[PDB]
Amino acid sequence: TCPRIVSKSEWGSRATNYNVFLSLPVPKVVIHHSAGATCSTQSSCSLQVRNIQNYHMDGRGYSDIGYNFLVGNDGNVYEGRGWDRRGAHALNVNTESIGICFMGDFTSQKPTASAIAAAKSLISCGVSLGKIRSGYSLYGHRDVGSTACPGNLLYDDIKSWGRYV
């Protein structure tokens, strides 16, 4: 029931050495969006992940891509920092959350149903592993921190997801 996850090596992540850990199991799950390009192919989504990684490391000086996981409109999940490591994404809920980023801009378009589905089964996977508390809370990125955002179709959707807060 876990979704197939494209590992770092499978999307060609470059070599990192970020080794700051979350205290498992994690209470919160935050949902983000790249506010960028979408992608419908595994190879084209893989490129996008690499582009984002490079932006974060070369552009912003992060020690790795900032999100724990990314989701493509191809329906796939891509590993970033993964289950055990701490994001740079959301402040200061980085310290106790998994960040899941949908690759796209969702102000006038909705993510693909398979992209939505992969995220949910990813969350369910983490719970079943005990990476995430069974009674987790779910937030959009605007919910958690003091950041303004425009009307967004992704964040409308996550309201109907279980455990939304």
Residue numbers in the entry: 1 to 165
Task: Provide the authors' own sentences about this structure as they appear in the paper.
PGNs are normally recognized, and/or hydrolyzed (amidases EC 3.5.1.28) in some cases, by a class of PRRs, termed peptidoglycan recognition proteins (PGRPs). The catalytic PGRPs possess the amidase activity that hydrolyzes the amide bond between the MurNAc and L-alanine moieties of PGN, via a coordinated Zn2+ ion. The full-length BbtPGRP3 consists of an N-terminal signal peptide (Met1−Ala18), followed by a CBD (Gln19−Tyr71) and a C-terminal PGRP domain (Thr90−Gly255), which are connected via an 18-residue linker from residues Ser72 to Gly89. All together, the modular evolution via gene horizontal transfer and domain shuffling results in a unique domain organization of BbtPGRP3, which has a higher amidase activity and a broader spectrum against invading bacteria.
The PGRP domain shows a typical PGN-binding domain scaffold, in which six β-strands (β4~9) compose a central β-sheet surrounded by five α-helices (α2~6) and a short 310 helix η1. The two disulfide bonds (Cys91-Cys214 and Cys128-Cys134) further stabilize the PGRP domain. Multiple-sequence alignment showed that BbtPGRP3 possess a highly conserved Gly-Tyr motif (Gly150-Tyr151) and an arginine residue Arg170, which are featured in the Group II PGRPs. Using HADDOCK server, we docked tracheal cytotoxin (TCT, GlcNAc-MurNAc(1,6-anhydro)-L-Ala-γ-D-Glu-meso-Dap-D-Ala) and muramyl pentapeptide (MPP, MurNAc-L-Ala-D-isoGln-L-Lys-D-Ala-D-Ala), which represent the DAP-type and Lys-type PGNs respectively, to the active-site valley of PGRP domain. The side-chain carboxylate of DAP forms a bidentate salt bridge with the guanidinium group of the conserved Arg170 docked TCT-complexed model, whereas residues Gly150 and Tyr151 interact with the side chain of L-Lys via van der Waals interactions in the MPP-complexed model. Moreover, structural comparison suggested that the complementary electropotential between DAP and Arg170 makes DAP-type PGN a favored substrate. Compared to the individual PGRP domain, fusion of the CBD resulted in an approximately 500% augmentation of activity towards S. aureus PGNs, compared to a 50% increase towards E. coli PGNs. It indicated that CBD contributes to the hydrolytic activity towards PGNs (especially the Lys-type) of the PGRP domain.
